[PDB]
């Protein structure tokens, strides 16, 4: 462990061993100094135009943290293709992390002349919340993950959290955390850091589509031995009389056959078309949105319960807030045009989950009588029922991977709504910070704390390795399958490559449900 | 009791259905619920009861 | 008896996860909006279990 | 304090004030019992089945405030469905990234628990 | 504890129908027995207030 | 008449917080009063002044 | 400049009271406020709002 | 003991073991 020797090699690879696949990636990071080594109370109440729905209260810390909760951080596009085109399901098993080749540099800004030199004696601090004692900030689709293209250098995000509030004020249950209160490890140039982690058991992800629909499971050649009320009036003429009349459903009345199962739950959203002329001429992006009310404040249901994006022949429609929406390369931050974002589509689950923009069904509304015609009413939101079967939301190459299940008393099907694996003990957070170095102190003692430090930052490499378990397909389907492939026609650039400027780009989102399977 | 029912054909119109992939389907027999409360044995749900046919019963209507 | 002779409990502590007992769970789409039809939305006053719901139990007392 | 022991009684199915064919009647003397005179004692033991701990704590965070307040998301949401111009608004599909100033609009992973609305009343 | 003699050692059919002003919602039918029973399904039957304080101020669950 | 005794063994789950600032705790009032909470009157009548929950400590979600 | 670390081991004397009624405990206020006691401002300046003794539990003479 | 290696880690913690409690703090 000397200054003149490296502390690790560049491991970036992926191997396939059958039911196993082991990904490995390495990147170069840079860590600035946040908040001038200060903790700061941050808050925003209903002051100004800030509505009650957007109030908060929390703290910003001088620490940074690593993030790789994104699939494209570990799979090349070719590897994603290899995976999704040949396997029915998969799940992670283990993980390894490593930091090495640390180098700290200080910057002297003198009369515009900016100079950078090495500071061989400075340190950084690193520790992992292996006991889940800090607010778990990962799993919220924040930026700052590892770049997709390994040749990119990225900046480490700053750590901050929120707690309970009342407007812009705190309450008696508000918590304050000081990260320095944790046992941490200090590294100089020549030290390295690493640790390992094991995933808890979790069901495989359903990387397939169903080749049958829920309402078409019967034999199309034979009838049932059951009966159903086929008619409640006399089949005669204009003098119809009350009668109770039954028949056996069969091939010509499959809509009436008795069934054993039932579609999954729903929470109706607002439908909107990509043909601007087909929409209402008014701004109802927030007014007509599907929200939920909690503690007096309202919140948008995004993306909400996994439901079918649209029924057949209606690809121009999509739920207002029921679809993951990625932005194209170099897209602006606020209020961009539709042409710069890429909409996903969960159409593949039409077989079991209801369409997100229609009612679950229709149910009896009153007690019919001789003088009262029967009335029926729409169901726009339906909780779980015994016999319901549904599918989860699909994952994507540039989507999240896992999320932490909130530690509460009860829950129901703890799969993350944004898609991925829900865990009780997710991979622990990894935090990092530059150790402060004070400038020259005064010559006489003073009680006041130091406030002048040397401006500096640091950089180094980081590597992650994940082992995945595979579930190979075992189909007996005769005809060929649908596979994700790239276009065969000539184009100016190559998909998933660099421009003439070296700017990486992803042309479209990529799901994982291509293979098929019976219900 | 045929006289106690509405005089109109509502075996399909007033039925309890569910909507899936643009097509509607009858809820038969549906969730297990009590057939009728006390002293009302002459009542029954339109599509909430298993219905067997007697020996030699016809197929349709 | 009069109110002054009873002692009411309070489950205010679960405001973080469970809905307020005297308000709606939320609001959901009610119809298919169009160029000539403004979108309509309706209150949900009773909601069964959904995948992804998390809640807390009622507190105990001495 | 000295206390009095309550009396045992139970109910069964009924129709108004009458019983039905499924009504059950139990005679406690039909059980094997132990008799004690002055000088005898009685005792027994019991083991509880497994059961989750009771949550004797409050949450320091709310469900809708789990995000990092400093960083935005890489996702988007329909931010506006009309033209940001004047009195001649035209249909458009317009998106943005939620962040610290729009936490009510950020995408989330979980959802509040079930409800059954009751009537509110003030003191 | 003190145990009296209930019902003069008799089992008795007890019931109340919709007769009188008793609504249909409050009908019942059952039996009253000459037996007594013990009950301690109450927390204060085992914890002193000081012990309840000691417990709730230092533990996450039990 | 006679005596009766019950004995229950409970299992505990100690807290493991890293919260910096102090916590909310259930305490009794420090100001003078005619009687003492959870004690007897001049007649020997026990009384409980208020209900007592169990959720005082905090924890992250 | 550099780092420095101190570690002290303390011995405790647990209480053994038989007092019935609840005890006085040091707790933080439950009512909303602009800042949190024993935390930082919007400037990162730590502060201690009040002095804290150690005599809260009771004992006979 | 080289110039390019740290000589200690950040220990700031407190553990409770019954009748014992062990505090630990670190400063710059």
- List, as one string, the DSSP characters of A335-392: SEEGGGEEE---GGGTTTSPBTTS-SEEEE-S---SSS---EEEESEE---TTB---P
CB contact under 8 A, A173 and F21: no
Write down the CATH superfamily of domain A1-519: Parvovirus coat protein VP1/VP2 (2.170.30.10)
Chain A residue at shortest CA distance from C38: A280
Q: What is the DSSP letter of A415?
A: -
Resolution in A: 2.6
CB contact under 8 A, A172 and F18: no
- The dihedral region occupied by A341, where left means phi > 0, alpha psi between -120 and 50, and beta the remainder, is beta
Domain boundaries, chain A: 1-519
Q: What would the DSSP string read from start to end of F2-50? A: -----------EE------S---------S--SS-TTSB-TT--B---S
Closest CA to A512 of A375, A346, A369, A351: A346
Contact B18, B27 (CB under 8 A): yes
Chain breaks in chain A (C to N over 2.5 A) after: none
**Cα–Cα dist F18/C10, whole Å:** 27
Contact D13, D20 (CB under 8 A): yes
- The neighbours of chain A, by the rule of 3 or more Cβ pairs under 8 Å, are B, C, D, F, G, H
Those residues of chain E whose CB sits closer than 8 Å to some CB in chain G are 48-50, 52-53, 57
Question: Residue-wise over B26-54: b if at least 16 C-beta within 10 A, else e?
Answer: bbbbbeeeeeeeeeeeeeebbbbeeeeee
- Which of C12, C55, C59, C62 should be substituted to probe chain F, the one whose Cβ sees the most F Cβ atoms within 10 Å? C62
**Cα–Cα dist A362/D100, whole Å:** 41
Contact A184, H10 (CB under 8 A): yes
**Cα–Cα dist A27/A155, whole Å:** 11
- The neighbours of chain C, by the rule of 3 or more Cβ pairs under 8 Å, are A, D, E, F
DSSP β-ladder status, A430-434 and A124-128: antiparallel
User: Any bridge partners for residue A115, and if so which?
Assistant: A108
Of E1, E57, E62, the CB nearest to F2: E1
Q: How far is CA D59 from CA A7, A172, C15, F3, F9, in A?
A: 43, 12, 9, 43, 28
Instruction: Answer positive or negative: Cα dihedral of D9, D13, D14, D19.
Output: negative
Those residues of chain B whose CB sits closer than 8 Å to some CB in chain A are 2-11, 13-29, 31-32, 46-47, 50-53, 59-61
Tell me if the bond preceding F41 is cis, omega within 30° of 0: no
Those residues of chain G whose CB sits closer than 8 Å to some CB in chain F are 20-28, 30, 36-39
Q: What is the CB-side half-sphere exposure of residue G57 using CA atoms within 13 A?
A: 11
Q: Is residue A245 within a helix (H) or strand (E), and if so which, with residue range?
A: strand A242-247
**Cα–Cα dist A197/A94, whole Å:** 6
Q: What is the CB-side half-sphere exposure of residue D85 using CA atoms within 13 A?
A: 10
CB contact under 8 A, A38 and G34: no
Q: Which structure tokens are listed for D115?
A: 């409800």
Place of tokens 């957007």: A54
Q: What would the DSSP string read from start to end of A293-332? A: EETTEEEE--S-S--BS--TT-TTEEETTSS-EEEPTT--
Q: Which structure tokens are listed for A350?
A: 């039409």
Q: What is the DSSP letter of A138?
A: -
Of G21, G25, G37, the CB nearest to F38: G21
Residue A405 to chain C, least CA–CA distance (Å): 9
Residue A82 in 3-state DSSP? helix
Q: Which structure tokens are listed for A473?
A: 């397909």
**Cα torsion through A493, A495, A499, A505, rounded to 10:** 150
**Cα–Cα dist A76/G24, whole Å:** 62
Place of tokens 């079967």: A389
Residues 6 or more apart in contact with residue A330 via CB below 8 angstroms: A503
| Phi, psi of D29, rounded to the nearest 5 degrees | -65, -15
Closest CA to G56 of F22, A488, A34: F22
DSSP β-ladder status, E59-61 and E28-36: unpaired
Contact A66, A154 (CB under 8 A): no
Residue A188 in 3-state DSSP? coil
* Touch between B and F (at least 3 CB pairs under 8 Å): no
Residue A258 in 3-state DSSP? coil
**Cα–Cα dist F61/A175, whole Å:** 12
Q: Which structure tokens are listed for C32?
A: 């298919």
Residues 6 or more apart in contact with residue F35 via CB below 8 angstroms: F41, F47
Of A183, A191, A436, the CB nearest to H6: A191
- The dihedral region occupied by A141, where left means phi > 0, alpha psi between -120 and 50, and beta the remainder, is left
User: Any bridge partners for residue A337, and if so which?
Assistant: D94
Q: Which structure tokens are listed for D91?
A: 């249909």
**Cα–Cα dist A213/E50, whole Å:** 62
DSSP β-ladder status, D115-116 and C46-47: antiparallel
């Amino acid at each position: 462990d000397g200054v003149g020797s490296s502390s690790g090699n560049w491991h970036c690879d992926s191997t396939w061993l059958g039911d196993r696949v082991i990904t490995t990636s390495t990147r170069t990071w840079a860590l600035p100094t946040y908040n001038n080594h200060l903790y700061k109370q941050i808050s925003n109440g209903t002051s100004g135009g800030s509505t009650n729905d957007n109030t908060y209260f929390g703290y910003s810390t001088p620490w940074g943290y690593f993030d790789f909760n994104r699939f494209h951080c570990h799979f090349s596009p070719r590897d994603w293709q290899r995976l999704i085109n040949n396997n029915w399901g998969f799940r992670p098993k283990r993980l390894s992390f490593k930091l090495f080749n640390i180098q700290v540099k200080e910057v002297t800004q003198n009369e515009g002349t900016k100079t950078i030199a090495n500071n061989l004696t400075s340190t950084i601090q690193v520790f992992t919340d292996s006991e889940y004692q800090l607010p778990y900030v990962l799993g919220s689709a924040h930026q700052g993950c590892l770049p997709p293209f390994p040749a990119d250098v990225f900046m480490i995000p700053q750590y901050g959290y929120l707690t309970l509030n009342n407007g812009s004020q705190a309450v008696g249950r508000s918590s304050f955390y000081c990260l320095e209160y944790f046992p941490s490890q200090m590294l100089r140039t020549g030290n390295n850091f690493e640790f390992s982690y094991t995933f808890e058991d979790v069901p495989f992800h359903s990387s397939y589509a169903h080749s049958q629909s829920l309402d078409r499971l019967m034999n199309p050649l034979i009838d049932q031995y059951l009966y159903y009320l086929s008619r409640t009036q006399s089949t005669g003429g204009t003098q119809g009389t009350q009668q109770l009349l039954f028949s056996q459903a069969g091939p010509a009345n499959m809509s009436a056959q008795a069934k054993n199962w039932l579609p999954g739950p729903c929470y109706r959203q607002q439908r909107v078309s990509t043909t601007l002329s087909q929409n209402n001429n008014s701004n109802f992006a927030w007014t007509g949105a599907t929200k939920y009310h909690l503690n007096g404040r309202d919140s948008l249901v995004n993306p909400g319960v996994a439901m079918a994006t649209h029924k057949d022949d209606e690809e121009r429609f999509f739920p207002s807030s029921g679809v993951l929406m990625f932005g194209k390369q170099g897209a602006g931050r606020d209020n961009v045009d539709y042409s710069s974002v890429m909409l996903t589509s969960e159409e593949e689950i039409k077989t079991t989950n209801p369409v997100a923009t229609e009612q679950y069904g229709v149910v009896a509304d009153n007690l019919q009588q001789t003088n009262t015609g029967p009335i029926v009413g729409n169901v726009n939101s339906q909780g779980a029922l015994p016999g319901m079967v549904w599918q989860n939301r699909d994952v994507y190459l540039q989507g999240p991977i896992w999320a932490k299940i909130p530690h509460t008393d009860g829950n129901f099907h703890p799969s993350p709504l944004m898609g991925g694996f829900g865990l009780k003990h997710p991979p622990p957070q990894i935090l990092i910070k530059n150790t402060p170095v004070p400038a020259d102190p005064p010559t006489t003692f003073s009680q006041a704390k130091l406030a002048s430090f040397i401006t500096q930052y640091s950089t180094g490499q980081v590597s992650v390795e994940i082992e995945w378990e595979l579930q190979k397909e075992n189909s007996k389907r005769w005809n060929p399958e649908i596979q994700y492939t790239s276009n065969y026609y000539k184009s100016t650039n190559v998909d998933f490559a660099v421009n003439t400027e070296g700017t990486y780009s992803e042309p479209r989102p990529i799901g994982t449900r291509y293979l098929t399977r019976n219900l």
